[PDB]
Amino acid sequence: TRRTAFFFDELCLWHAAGPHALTLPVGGWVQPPAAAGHAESPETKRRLKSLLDVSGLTARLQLRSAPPASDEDLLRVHPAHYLERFKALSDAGGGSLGQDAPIGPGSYEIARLSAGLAIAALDAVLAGEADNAYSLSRPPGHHCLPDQAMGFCFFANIAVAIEAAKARHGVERVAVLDWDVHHGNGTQAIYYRRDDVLSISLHQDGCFPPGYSGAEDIGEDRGRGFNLNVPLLPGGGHDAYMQAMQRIVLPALERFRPQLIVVASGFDANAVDPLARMQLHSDSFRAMTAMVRDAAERHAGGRLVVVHEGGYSEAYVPFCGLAVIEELSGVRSAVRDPLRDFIELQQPNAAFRDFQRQRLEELAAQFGLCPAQPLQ
Amino acid sequence: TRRTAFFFDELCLWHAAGPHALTLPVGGWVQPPAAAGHAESPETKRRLKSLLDVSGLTARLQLRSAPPASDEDLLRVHPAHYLERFKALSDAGGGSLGQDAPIGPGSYEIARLSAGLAIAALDAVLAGEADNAYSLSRPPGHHCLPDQAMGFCFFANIAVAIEAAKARHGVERVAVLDWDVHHGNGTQAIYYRRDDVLSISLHQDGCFPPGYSGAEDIGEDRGRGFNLNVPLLPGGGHDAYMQAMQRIVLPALERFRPQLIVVASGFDANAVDPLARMQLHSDSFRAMTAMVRDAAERHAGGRLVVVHEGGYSEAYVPFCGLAVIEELSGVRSAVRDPLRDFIELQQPNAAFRDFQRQRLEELAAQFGLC
Amino acid sequence: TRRTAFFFDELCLWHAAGPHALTLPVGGWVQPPAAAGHAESPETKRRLKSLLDVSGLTARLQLRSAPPASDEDLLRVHPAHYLERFKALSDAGGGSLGQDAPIGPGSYEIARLSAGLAIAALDAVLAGEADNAYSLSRPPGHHCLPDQAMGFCFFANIAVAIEAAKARHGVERVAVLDWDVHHGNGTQAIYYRRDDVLSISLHQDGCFPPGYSGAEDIGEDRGRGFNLNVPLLPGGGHDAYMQAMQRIVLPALERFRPQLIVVASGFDANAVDPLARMQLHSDSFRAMTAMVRDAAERHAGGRLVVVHEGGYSEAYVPFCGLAVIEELSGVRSAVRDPLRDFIELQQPNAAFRDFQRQRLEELAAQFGLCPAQPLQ
Amino acid sequence: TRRTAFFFDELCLWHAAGPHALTLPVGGWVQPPAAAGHAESPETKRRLKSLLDVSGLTARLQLRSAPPASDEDLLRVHPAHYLERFKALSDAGGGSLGQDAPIGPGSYEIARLSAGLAIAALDAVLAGEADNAYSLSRPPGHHCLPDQAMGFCFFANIAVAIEAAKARHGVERVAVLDWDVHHGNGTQAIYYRRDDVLSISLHQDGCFPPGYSGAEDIGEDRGRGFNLNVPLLPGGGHDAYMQAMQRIVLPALERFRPQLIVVASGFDANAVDPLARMQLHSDSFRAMTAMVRDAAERHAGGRLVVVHEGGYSEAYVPFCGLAVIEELSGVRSAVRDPLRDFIELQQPNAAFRDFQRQRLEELAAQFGLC
Ligand SMILES: O=C(CCCCCCC(O)(O)C(F)(F)F)Nc1ccccc1
Ligand SMILES: O=C(CCCCCCC(O)(O)C(F)(F)F)Nc1ccccc1
Ligand SMILES: O=C(CCCCCCC(O)(O)C(F)(F)F)Nc1ccccc1
Ligand SMILES: O=C(CCCCCCC(O)(O)C(F)(F)F)Nc1ccccc1
Ligand SMILES: [K+]
Ligand SMILES: [K+]
Ligand SMILES: [K+]
Ligand SMILES: [K+]
Ligand SMILES: [K+]
Ligand SMILES: [K+]
Ligand SMILES: [K+]
Ligand SMILES: [K+]
Ligand SMILES: [Zn+2]
Ligand SMILES: [Zn+2]
Ligand SMILES: [Zn+2]
Ligand SMILES: [Zn+2]
Structure with a gap:
């Protein structure tokens, strides 16, 4: 059977923003919640860890932590002044690092650890220490731009991990599949003119960033054809995602021949998530x-x-x-x-499924993707 | 300007079930929440009341409470044995009254008060005490069947209120528009063979009860044509609802000529609700x-x-x-x-809006409302 | 029967600080709470209001709100630069206004309203609109100094209300009895050299401010004898407080002849309070x-x-x-x-009660208080 | 350095009672909490585990779990009918097992695991697998009587562990020091006529059970002198406990010569606890x-x-x-x-410290430990 490393640190569960009602900052007309604060709360991630423990899964994994990301690792993506500003705000008790990017006291150190777990998870798999890995990286990363925190993300975790992996191991082709329900705009922007990273985002059309679809944004110049956005209709479920995987994702991976696959795995496409409609x-x-x-x-x-x-x-x-x-x-x-x-x-229903399927067929043709079968 | 009665009682906010994670009973693989609890929590309704107060709106309304529903009012819909079972379970600290219908200690009395508010709101409007009314009835009502609690509903609040209004005031034609995102199955069932109550449900196709669409269920015999279900595609928003209102709801109300309109107003079609996808x-x-x-x-x-x-x-x-x-x-x-x-x-997007619009056009034609 | 005004505004329940575990700022070794945040939470005050409503009491009171405190009212106690600093921090999302004085977004406006309720409650009673009044003033006031927020207090509510009442009504003798379990240091400091306000604090010896007893601090010069601290032994209950009332408080009021009595009524001497031991x-x-x-x-x-x-x-x-x-x-x-x-x-037990009683007898003698009976 | 076994299971943190405000059952005049719940919440114990992890201390301990307590182990203290009643109530979604002893769905299995951890911790130390051990046993045990749950305790964890240890290892003299701020009435009762277990309780005078002091209850017949209660005055802190330890506890342990020491370690004498005044x-x-x-x-x-x-x-x-x-x-x-x-x-202050010290001197003399 497979050897799966589980990168986890309890301290990642200690990151917490100031009072929010779901995603709304408390203040003005938004009353402070009596209990449940910001949507990006520790509790989702903590309950996953708890269920892994009681199920007996954790005992079957290679449980690993990692050092926090160094300034050197972070500086491959982010400027020194971004790090300084982030740390200053974190030391001053937290506040607003960007639009929809609130931080708390000590969030700077915890964000460095989150990035560190992602760095270490890629390293372990490239080093042959495990067949595959799961990194419980909180706070998240996939919206963060080099000089702009956004969508609850403060460092570009996956991008930082990839640039570190390239420096240490010299991997040439990495695919990033982002099935978080929101658009992976950070990963997209960083790698937009690069052919060494294929970035694919499955997302609810127009969810976050709001109004963004992005099917026509396929990368530019050297990166043309190495970015694919699949804007799924709000309300879609299992069939929509399976069709997207079969008609777009797998053909795209086949052509790219990744030496490493990274998944930006959000679970917010689940049927009871407040922050999307899938x-x-x-x-x-x-x-x-x-x-x-x-x-x-x-x-x-x-x-x-x-x-x-x-x-x-x-x-x-x-x-x-x-x-x-x-x-x-x-x-x-x-x-x-x-x-x-x-x-x-x-x-x-069948009519709605057929409607979405036809759009995915059209999109596959627009991307120039050949319906080949898996081989090798 | 209009006189709006706001029927509210603080005690309705004291109803609470045992531990749940969203809608899942705690137990087995479902860990108790550290804070949250059951989705049907006091907090949504309390935060509405708080915002009405902080906004100053409460000062412009006619604030009212009401007595709890009498056994007489409840018995027009529910059997005596249902009342007895419900009360027994409530007195014993709560538990499961139905499928997806958990109750807490004293929930029986609080459910009677919720029903009482709905009764009193209809009465006030029919009596001319206010032009219109809003009843903050918790626990909710629109899934409850005569002898079966379901979907967090323990009495059929709207049905109890309507049958009370018919007994007291003799209203002949009532329309019930249910824009809660889930199917108003309780109201539908009770009035299914009746032409004195037009029941219309806008709901997400297949959401709750799970897998139910219902467009072809238009009522039977005396009630044939006096029930309309509009199963909207998951993911729809403002335009889908505006098209449903303009092509189906308003024409249906015009044909029926209601002497009173009751809205079963859930807000769970909102864009960030966990319990639907609208x-x-x-x-x-x-x-x-x-x-x-x-x-x-x-x-x-x-x-x-x-x-x-x-x-x-x-x-x-x-x-x-x-x-x-x-x-x-x-x-x-x-x-x-x-x-x-x-x-x-x-x-x-436009393609998706057009797809839903065409389905609503087809449904309007099915209902004979072109 | 009596006419009681109940000064309340729902907005006072919307004040909320950043994440705290009880009184500890989240950060370092203090994990963010999963639910219950700062000890000074809206929920205590909200549950009082709810119980007043369901009990039928609220219907028997004169329910009143009030305008927020004006700059003029606030400036009788606090400097303009304090107001500016407070507002700036409140507009910037909150943070630390003092030691043990954390604020949230918009807390400035809510603190002004809290002070406004206290101002209006004194005004109503002096104007004869009600026989007496209760003001649900959150955030609280009795630790706040003119230029220093402390102990969850940002304006000196009672002092602001008194100085406003003196300006409007010309009241000459006000007694402030503070039975909050912590020392009323704000009221004490402001009125320390004044004989127009008798400040009495019953408090747990050494609780907050920590280590302060204060029995020998009786006021100075013009105010000598117009401040009384009763440092009750930790662990005391009903008898300790009754003896304090009978041997110290009532004799002190009798000599002072107040034209108005204000109570700084904290309930933290209750037997299950986390923040004291009474x-x-x-x-x-x-x-x-x-x-x-x-x-x-x-x-x-x-x-x-x-x-x-x-x-x-x-x-x-x-x-x-x-x-x-x-x-x-x-x-x-x-x-x-x-x-x-x-x-x-x-x-x-009886031995402990006797021990505390003897200390209160000694303290009454030290204050020069004569055991007279109530009259007039 | 010492080898410390840390007995823990995540499932112990999944035990949860129905809605309570602190220790008050929700119902009547007690409003459901918006967040909180029952005082015996998972969160205190979880936050200890989390801090042990973030501090790095967990990496220096011998981490262990254990099987749940067998019926055989439980039956040394508790009757079969107690087990049956407890399980029935647990399977029926929880409720009230005793006075101040509320349970939730599945609490029966979780209580068995809590007891199992205590059994295994004693076993490990007596077997020489570790020098000492800490057992994060939730739910707690020290108030539980053989046939009566009380004070949030459903099995007599320490007593079950001791009787199991005597059966397996034949230990002759065990001391139980109970520094939970409340009286260890369960341990006291079970061992009251026994000289093989010295039970000592430091507690706030009259806290829980309410009004109980107990200084004169020193055991009976064979157990006379093998139970010591130290009822500390409410409000006492560090010095009161240090004086109790030096004047009573240590001398008592010296006289008894325990072959094993078990501590019933509650932390509710801490300075910010809601359930005591120390x-x-x-x-x-x-x-x-x-x-x-x-x-x-x-x-x-x-x-x-x-x-x-x-x-x-x-x-x-x-x-x-x-x-x-x-x-x-x-x-x-x-x-x-x-x-x-x-x-x-x-x-x-010094006067209060002196007052308590003198009472402890008098109590030490009463116990014959001058
Ligand atoms: O902007 C938002 C929603 C932010 C959603 C970010 C999603 C984050 C993520 O899950 O993909 C991940 F990064 F965590 F993974 N709300 C508003 C807008 C305006 C005003 C208030 C609130
Ligand atoms: O119970 C549900 C869904 C219940 C949804 C009820 C909606 C109630 C309502 O909003 O319309 C109103 F009535 F409150 F208005 N899911 C589960 C639970 C357990 C196991 C699987 C799925
Ligand atoms: O200082 C405190 C306790 C503050 C207690 C203030 C009491 C406020 C009050 O009730 O009297 C009233 F004003 F609200 F009424 N804790 C610490 C100390 C150091 C570090 C962290 C926490
Ligand atoms: O029940 C209580 C107090 C119960 C205290 C139990 C302490 C348990 C414990 O810590 O020692 C240990 F066992 F957990 F360790 N009060 C009420 C409840 C209802 C009505 C009045 C008073
Ligand atoms: K995505
Ligand atoms: K790319
Ligand atoms: K509906
Ligand atoms: K009908
Ligand atoms: K005081
Ligand atoms: K004075
Ligand atoms: K004890
Ligand atoms: K004994
Ligand atoms: Zn997302
Ligand atoms: Zn609904
Ligand atoms: Zn206080
Ligand atoms: Zn205890």
Whole structure:
């Protein structure tokens, strides 16, 4: 069976912003919550860890921590003045580092650790210490720009990890598949003119950043054709994502021949997430993980890293994350998803499924993707 | 300007079930929440009340409470043994009254008060004490069957209120528009063979009850044509609802000529709700309220009652409920919805809007409302 | 029966600091709480309001709000630069205004409203609009110094209200009885050399400010003898407070002849409070209120204002506040205190009670207080 | 340095009662909390575990779990019908198992695991697998009687562990020092006529059970002199506990010559606990642990087990528990207690300290320990 490293540090669960109601800063007409604060709360990630423990999964993984990201690692993406400004605000008790990017006291150090876990997870897999890895990187990364925090992200975790991996191991082709329900704009921007990183984002059309679809943004010059956005219709579920995987993602990976696959794995496409309108269940995440693991085994010697991004349902994210880790490790626990059958009944009807399928067929043709089968 | 009665009692906010993570009972693989609890929490409804107070709107409403529903009122819909079972479980510290219907200690008395508020709101509007009314009825009602609690509902609040109103005032034609995002199966069942109550449900296709669409279920015998289900595609927002209102709801109300309109107003079609996948903002609820108020003014002498049902976003339901009450009262507060512009950017694209519009055109033709 | 004004505004319940675990700022070794934030949370005060509503008490009171305190009112106590600094920090999302004085976004406006309620409550009682009043003033006031926020207090609410009342009504003798369990250092400092305000603090010896007892601090020069501190031994309950009232407070009021009595009413001497070690129950607060109401009826034409200060037990403060309001209004609700009998059993034993009684006898003699009986 | 086993299972943190405001059942005049819940919450114990992890201390301990307590182990203390009643109530979604003993869904299995951890911790220390041990046993045990749950305790964890240890290893003299701030009435009752177990309770005079002091209850017949209660005055802190340890506890342990010391370690004597009125800081718990470890080294070959009982300050219990584990292990982390200096300033004054000291001198003389 497979050796799966689980990169985790309890301190990542200690990052916390000032009072928010969901994503709204408290103040003006927004009353402070009586309990549940900012949507990016420790509790989703903590409940995943707890379920991994009680299920017996954690005992079957290689549990690892890592040193925090060095200034050197961070400076490959971010300027010194960004680091200074972030640290100053963190030392002064927190506040607003960007639009939709609130920080708390000591968040700077915790963000460095989150980035460090992602760096170390790529390193372990490239070094052959594990077949694959899951990094519980909080705070998340995939919206962060080099000089602009956004969407709850303060460092560009995956980009920092990739640039570190290139410096240490000399990997030439990395694919980043971002199935967080929101657009991976940070990864897209950083690698937009680069052909050494294929960035693919599956996202709800127009969700975040708001109004962005992006199908026509395929990269430029050297990077032309090495960025793919799949703007799925709000309301879609299992079939929409499976069709996207089969018609766009897998053909794109086949042409690119990645030596390493990184997944920006948010769980906010789940059917009860407040921050998007998609209808995935735990078995959808399982199936996506199975597909990308297979692609990694065919092109990249099994080298796959999954980095935790979003997911805002305290109740349901634990089941979705568990499914991914079971699939990475090849270990099936006794956990049974209590919402699975219910979510199956809520799925788009045949007319809606056909409508989305036709759009994905059109998009695959627009990308110039050939419907080949998996081989090698 | 209009006189809007606001039926509220603080005790309705004291109803609470045992530990749940969202809708999942704690136990087995479901870890107890560190804070949260059950999705049907007091906090959504409390935060609406708080925002009404801080906005100053409460000062422009006619604030009212009401006695709890009498056994007589409850027994028009529910059997004595249902009342007994419910009370016994409530006295024993709570537990499971139905499928997805958990109760807490004393929930029985609080459910009677919730029903009482709905009864009193209809009565006030029919008596001419107010032009219209909003009832903050928690726990909710629109899924409850005569002998079966479901979907967090323990009495059929709107049905109890209607049967009480018919007994006291003799109203002949009532329309119930249910814009809670889930199917109003309780109201549908009770009035399914009746032509004195037109029941219309806008809901996300297949959301709750799970897998139910219902477009072909138009009522039977005497009630044939007096039930309309509009199963909207998941992911739809403002335009989907505006098209449903213009092509189906308003024409249906025009044909029926209601003497009273009741709205089963859940806010769970809002764009950040965990329990559905729709994309409404506060101005969508404002516009729906404006449309139904206009229909009430045309047919029912302005007689409109809005009864609070679902809505599970603590942050956003208050803004949506506020918009409804502003529209009922004709008073605009200083409150500005902080998510409005953001939600407008997230709406379905033109292709998706066209797809849904065509389905609504087809459905309107099915219903004979071209 | 009596006419009791209840000064309340829902917006006072919207003040909220950044993440704290009890009184500890989150950061370093202090993990963010999963639910319950700073000890000075809205929930204690909100649960009091809720219980007043469901009990039917609120319907028997004169429910009033008030305009926020003007700059003019605030400037009688606080400097312009303090107001500027406070507002700037409030507009920038909150943070630390002093030691143990954290603020949130918009806290400046809410603090002005809290001060406004206290101003208006004194005004109503002096104007004859009500016999007495209760002001649910959050955030609290009694630790705040003219140029230093402290102990969760940002304006000196009672002092601001008194200076406003002197300017508007020309009241000559005001007594402030502070039964919040912590020392009323703000009120003490402001009035320390003044004989127009008698400040009395009952407090747990050394609790907050930490290590302060203060029995020998009786005021200076013109104010000598017009400040009295009663440092009660930690662990004391009903008898300790009754003895303090009878041997010190009532004799001190009798000599002073107040024209108005203000109570700085914290409920944090209750038997389950985390922020002190005293053993009061709801009937202790009832009895203290009865004693001070009687003193107000004898000297001040019934003019009594109770201003809410501390109290950190979400479960129990509502019962204690309810008892005070019942006693002010002369209306007894159906509410029965579920902890009353239990707390009675926990009281100090006879030896401990005798030990504290003897100290209070000694302190009364040290203050030069004659054991006279109530008259007039 | 010392080998310290840390017995923990994540599932112990999943036990949860129905809605309570602190210790008050929700219902009647007690409003449901918006967040909080019952005082015996997972969060205190979870935050201790989290701080042990972030401090790096967990990496220097021998991390262990254990099987749940078998029926055989439980039945040495509790009757079969007690087990049956408890399980039935647990399977039915929870409720009230005793006076101040509420349970939740599945609490039965979780209580068995809590007891199992205590059993295994004693076993490991007696087997020489570790020099000493800390068991994070939730739910707690020290109030539980053989046939009566009380004070949030459902099995008599320490007693079950001791009777199991006597059956397996044949230990003849065990001392149980209970520094939870409340009276260890369960342990006291079970061992009241026994001289093979010395039970000592330090507690706030009259706290819980309410009104109980107990200085004169020294055991009976064969057990006369093998139970000692030290009812400390409410408001006491560091000096009161240090004087109790030096004048009563250590002399009592010297006379008894324990072959094993078990500590019922609640942290609810801490200075910010809602459920008592005492003024300890983390260094008080450190010092108590140092003193009892030294006694264990002198008489019991170092064999010391600390079993977690109470402690209701989410913010402060983690620092107190950390100090105990540092002292057991001989490892000092980088953690600095942020309340330590503040709590030192709040301590009883000299007159009050002298008053309590004199009472302890008198009590030591009563016990014949001058
Ligand atoms: O902007 C937002 C939503 C932010 C959503 C970020 C998603 C983050 C993420 O899950 O992908 C991940 F990065 F965490 F992974 N709300 C508003 C807008 C305007 C005003 C208030 C609130
Ligand atoms: O119970 C649900 C969904 C219940 C949704 C009820 C909606 C109620 C309502 O808003 O319309 C109103 F009535 F409140 F208004 N899911 C589960 C639970 C357990 C297991 C699987 C799925
Ligand atoms: O200083 C404190 C406790 C503050 C207590 C203020 C009491 C406020 C009050 O109730 O009287 C009233 F004003 F609210 F009414 N804790 C520490 C110390 C150091 C480090 C962290 C925490
Ligand atoms: O129940 C209580 C106090 C219970 C205290 C139990 C302490 C348990 C413990 O810490 O020692 C340990 F066992 F957990 F360790 N009060 C009420 C409740 C209802 C009505 C009145 C008073
Ligand atoms: K994405
Ligand atoms: K690229
Ligand atoms: K509906
Ligand atoms: K009908
Ligand atoms: K005081
Ligand atoms: K003075
Ligand atoms: K004890
Ligand atoms: K004994
Ligand atoms: Zn996301
Ligand atoms: Zn609903
Ligand atoms: Zn205080
Ligand atoms: Zn205890």
